[PDB]
Design a protein around this ligand. Structure first.
Ligand SMILES: CCCC[C@H](NC(=O)c1[nH]c2c(c1C)C(=O)CC(C)(C)C2)c1nc2ccccc2[nH]1
Ligand SMILES: CCCC[C@H](NC(=O)c1[nH]c2c(c1C)C(=O)CC(C)(C)C2)c1nc2ccccc2[nH]1
Ligand SMILES: Nc1ncnc2c1ncn2[C@@H]1O[C@H](C[C@@H](N)CC[C@H](N)C(=O)O)[C@@H](O)[C@H]1O
Ligand SMILES: Nc1ncnc2c1ncn2[C@@H]1O[C@H](C[C@@H](N)CC[C@H](N)C(=O)O)[C@@H](O)[C@H]1O
Ligand SMILES: [Zn+2]
Ligand SMILES: [Zn+2]
Ligand SMILES: [Zn+2]
Ligand SMILES: [Zn+2]
Ligand SMILES: [Zn+2]
Ligand SMILES: [Zn+2]
Ligand SMILES: [Zn+2]
Ligand SMILES: [Zn+2]
Lengths: 266, 270
């Protein structure tokens, strides 16, 4: 069975690079039961605080590579090396909040503290997996620490999330608590699966606003990733505690945490 | 015999598609820094802009949105951009129509033909010291008629706020004929447009445009060339008789055109 290219770019040109879709596994057509968006949307009054005088910002006259950058200090330090990658000493288990530079900073748009706001740079592909439906994999080697993509979707309150009947695309910001629901509106990140041996991590980031209701979710590689490797992050125990009553994990890792065999041993 | 100095390689600090340098060959005035350059409109208090994605009108096109089926074109009466991204010749240059560009709710691609203003500055511009009008903006290249130049960017404020500030040197009135009145004030936060002088023989026109939202209270202001512009020519638009009927009480127009309407030479004729 050939691996049919079925969409040249599921992002319709909204990302820096195309995201093709292929399926060499079954007959499932290119997913179209959602609206691809590259940035978060709202479907009720959120009124994100965008008051430019409310932004904390830096006064740097360099490239914001020094430890005196206020934006870096709000992040404990700027965690981006010279190439835009997270430092090796970055805490991949309890990631800090990242405050990037913004439109109030005196620095230039290309300073060292602007990785997530500059968008996707790696070649990704939406593909049909063997056991998990659609997935996302790398079309290039990706060094550890590289920004992959943002979890983009519909901004909704925790109360609205509690009413909705499909939480398969719901990312809880864990702040009043708000969520990103990618069920109806989403980007490439809604197709990234759970892996008990993840290779990307979510990190909360502020960029062009600092409304603490709405951190933005940035995925970075937690290790070097080989070409063709599926991308995945740890959906978390709360997800699998709820979803256990319906299905079990198919990641096939020797340290799988939620497989039938694994849960049966409990 | 003063030589021209380059005093900033990009007043936009890299926020635009292209750098916008500033030069002075006229006096000792340094690069203006009494404002904050921003590439997009800002808020200093809650405007409650309607950004509900389900309120967007959008098209269902699969092509490059060049057909008459495109709803976004229809909302503008038609799509007024030609294949090159220029406003059509028959486009009304007096009371122009609202332009509704395609948006994130449309099914078309980000590169369709109805996305000129949201794609940003493409022509090469220069901030320079004029002889009689302070700073101005001039073209570094030929600019054919109909080309998008830049957006009037600044701080969104209410009518009542504008009336408190009593300073319209950098104030653009959106002139919403229906309901709530808002202004763009580029005094404190602005982009290259704040530096565009008034000309009695103008070569650009402002056009109200909607892009990522369709809150009719907050059209965005897009400047397009109203004629072919030659390299070196200062850009300017007609500030409007209302501006001068207020300001001529204080100073006269220095555009120096034979068709000047606000000169001292012409102020004694009527
Ligand atoms: C589909 C999306 C992946 C599953 C999704 N993850 C998250 O919400 C989530 N929030 C957070 C993290 C993570 C994985 C972190 O790592 C840290 C944090 C960003 C601070 C907060 C999820 N978990 C759920 C639990 C119950 C009901 C629905 C659920 N959806
Ligand atoms: C300094 C900024 C350029 C002067 C500025 N122009 C405008 O507001 C303005 N609005 C409009 C157009 C124009 C020039 C149009 O061509 C048509 C339109 C876009 C529908 C509405 C101005 N004029 C004023 C008159 C009185 C008090 C303050 C003022 N500010
Ligand atoms: N490790 C996993 N084991 C089994 N199913 C998974 C796993 N990870 C993701 N899934 C499936 O994918 C859903 C989560 C989605 N966000 C991921 C995209 C999904 N695979 C799709 O094709 O749309 C889950 O509700 C599961 O149906
Ligand atoms: N036609 C004109 N004649 C004389 N002064 C003008 C003319 N057009 C603009 N100006 C001056 O520039 C102001 C408008 C500004 N938005 C333009 C930039 C301004 N020249 C500056 O140097 O900052 C006016 O209040 C005047 O001070
Ligand atoms: Zn800095
Ligand atoms: Zn900063
Ligand atoms: Zn910076
Ligand atoms: Zn597993
Ligand atoms: Zn269309
Ligand atoms: Zn459209
Ligand atoms: Zn379109
Ligand atoms: Zn004049």
């Amino acid at each position: 069975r050939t691996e049919k290219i079925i969409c040249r770019d599921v992002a319709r040109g909204y990302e820096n690079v195309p995201i093709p879709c292929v399926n060499g596994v079954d007959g499932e057509p290119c997913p179209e039961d959602y609206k691809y968006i590259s940035e978060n949307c709202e479907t009720s009054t959120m009124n994100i605080d965008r008051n430019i005088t409310h932004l904390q910002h830096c006064t740097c006259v360099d490239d914001c590579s020094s430890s005196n950058c206020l934006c870096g200090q709000l992040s404990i330090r700027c965690w981006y090396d010279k190439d835009g990658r997270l430092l090796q000493e970055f805490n991949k288990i309890e990631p800090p909040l990242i405050f990037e530079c913004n439109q109030a900073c005196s620095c230039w748009r290309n300073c060292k503290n602007r990785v997530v706001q500059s968008g996707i740079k790696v070649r990704l592909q939406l593909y049909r997996t063997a056991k998990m439906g659609w997935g996302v994999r790398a079309l290039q080697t990706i060094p550890q620490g590289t920004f992959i993509c943002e979890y983009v979707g519909e901004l909704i309150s925790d109360a609205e999330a509690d009413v909705r009947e499909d939480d398969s695309y719901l990312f809880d910001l864990d702040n009043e608590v708000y969520c990103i629901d990618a069920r109806y509106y989403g980007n490439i990140s809604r197709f990234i699966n759970h892996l008990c041996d993840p290779n990307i991590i979510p990190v909360r980031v502020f960029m062009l606003h600092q409304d603490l209701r709405f951190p933005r979710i940035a995925f970075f590689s937690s290790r070097d990733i080989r070409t063709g490797e599926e991308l995945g992050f740890d959906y978390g125990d709360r997800f699998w505690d709820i979803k256990s009553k319906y299905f079990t994990c198919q990641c096939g890792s020797e340290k799988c945490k939620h497989s039938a065999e694994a849960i049966a041993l409990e």
